[PDB]
A = this chain, B = another copy of it.
């Protein structure tokens, strides 16, 4: 009656292997923004595994805006790995 040493996890990464993230002194990192956005907005009808797919979509389209530098008009790409075995819905609230 046992299970694998590791399982039922799901990790989201702000950037791919080798690349860097994007922090902004006033808005923060894109990953966190995208995260807070998609989660608050869709946690109600979208499962963590699919919301991260959303965050991916957002992060993929975003371009860097910081003129005069070399960070201007740059890209970034998020990723996530999963060993989850069933949809993971956060069922926010659920009225008493």
Please give me the residue from chain B that is nearest to A84 by CB atom: B53
Please give me the residue from chain B that is nearest to A5 by CB atom: B75
Does chain B have a CB within 8 A of A87? yes
What is the number of residues of chain A that contact chain B, defined by CB distance less than 8 Å? 32
A-B contact pairs, 18 of them (CB 8 A): A1-B63, A2-B73, A4-B60, A4-B75, A4-B76, A5-B19, A5-B75, A5-B77, A7-B77, A16-B83, A49-B49, A49-B53, A56-B82, A56-B84, A60-B83, A79-B81, A80-B81, A80-B82
Please give me the residue from chain B that is nearest to A78 by CB atom: B83
A81 to B19, CA, bound (A): 16
Does chain B have a CB within 8 A of A86? yes
